[PDB]
Amino acid sequence: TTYADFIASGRTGRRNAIHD
C-alpha cells in the first residue's frame, strides 16, 4: 500500500523547510 511504502521509506521523519 502507499502507507506501507511510506514506512518502507525512511523519510517518515520531521520535514526540513526550504528557503531559496
Added chain:
Amino acid sequence: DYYQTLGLARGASDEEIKRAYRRQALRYHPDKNKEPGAEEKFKEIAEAYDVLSDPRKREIFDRYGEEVKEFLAKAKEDFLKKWESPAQNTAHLDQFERIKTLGTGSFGRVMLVKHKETGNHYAMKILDKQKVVKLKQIEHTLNEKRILQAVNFPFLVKLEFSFKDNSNLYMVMEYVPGGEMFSHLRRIGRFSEPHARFYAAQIVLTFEYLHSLDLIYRDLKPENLLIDQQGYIQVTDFGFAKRVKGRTWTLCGTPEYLAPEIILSKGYNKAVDWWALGVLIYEMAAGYPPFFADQPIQIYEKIVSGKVRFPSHFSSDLKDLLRNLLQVDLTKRFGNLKNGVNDIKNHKWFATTDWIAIYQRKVEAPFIPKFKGPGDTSNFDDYEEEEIRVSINEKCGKEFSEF
C-alpha cells in the same frame, strides 16, 4: 446555509432569490428527478426560499454572517493597533530558568523555561542572529515576531515576551504541553475522518482570521500544530508568515506542502494556505502526505502534475473536498473563489461541523494527551542540550534594531 442551497449571493435581490428558487426546484422536482436524495434536497430548497423571501426571517438568518463580519472588523482594529506599535524588550534572559530543549531548526531551538518570579512555564524560541543573517532570514524573523505579537485567536500560540541580547533573539511563548501533532500522528498511524475534521475545522477558522488580516501563514504541517490540554490545536512557528495585500514571490516552506505557484516563478497569494490545508487533511486522514519522494524536485513534479491518489478508506465527500483544495488551477481552488472560505465551511464533508462550537471550544476533543504536570515533557521528543552563549559584543545590531 440558505444562500448556498439556492446558489445565491448574500446581497441577492428579491428577484434573484425568486428565480434561483425556480431554477433549483426544477432540478430536484419529482417530475424530473427520482434519484436518491432528490426529495430531501427539494425540501431544503423550499426551506431556503421561505427564509430568504421573508424580510424578517432573512434579517435574522443574516445575523450569522454579520456576527462574523463584526468579529473580524474588531479583530482587525485590535491587530492594526499592535501592528503599528509592537511590543519590544518586555523581558530579559536572566528572568528564566532554562529546563530542556523542546525542538530545533536551522535557526535555533525552543526551550522549556520557567519564570523565576512567577514560576510560570513557557517555551522560549532562541534564534542566533549570525545564523539568521547567514541563512538570509532577516526579514522572515522580523515578520514572525511582529506578526505573533499582534494577533490573537484561540488556536494561535500566544507570544508572552520578546527581547534580544548581543547574540540571540528571544521569543517566549505560552507552553503547550501536549506535543506536536506530528508525533501523535506518526505514532497513531492516521486519524479517523471525524478526527482529522476536528483539527481541520480549527485550521479553517484560523486561516479565516489570518487572511482577514492579509496574513499568509505559509508553513502548515503537522510539525507546527501543538495539542493543548483540552486537545485543541495551537499553531506555532510563524517564521514564514507574511503580511501580503497583493502577491508575493518567495519560494519558502516545506516541499511536501508547497502549492504549485510557490514552486513556479509566478507570484502567489493567500490561496497557497488553502492548498496546504488540503495536504494537511490528506496526511492526517491517510497517514502520509500526497506527494513524497527523495528529491524535492521530484516532489515538485508530483505537485504540479495535477494528479492525486486517494486511499480506499477515503470517503466520497473527503475526496471531493480534497480535489477542490488540491486544485492546481488558482481560479478553481476552494478558498479562492467568489465565496471564499464559505465554500469550504459549506462543503458536505463539514456538514456535521458546528463552527461556533469549535471556536468556543465546546466540542469534545477526540484525543487528550497524557499529562503529568506543568512540566511533563514526555509528549515531546528529547534533543541534545547545547548551552546558550551570549557574546561580549553585539552582533548584527543594525539588522535587528526593530526586534
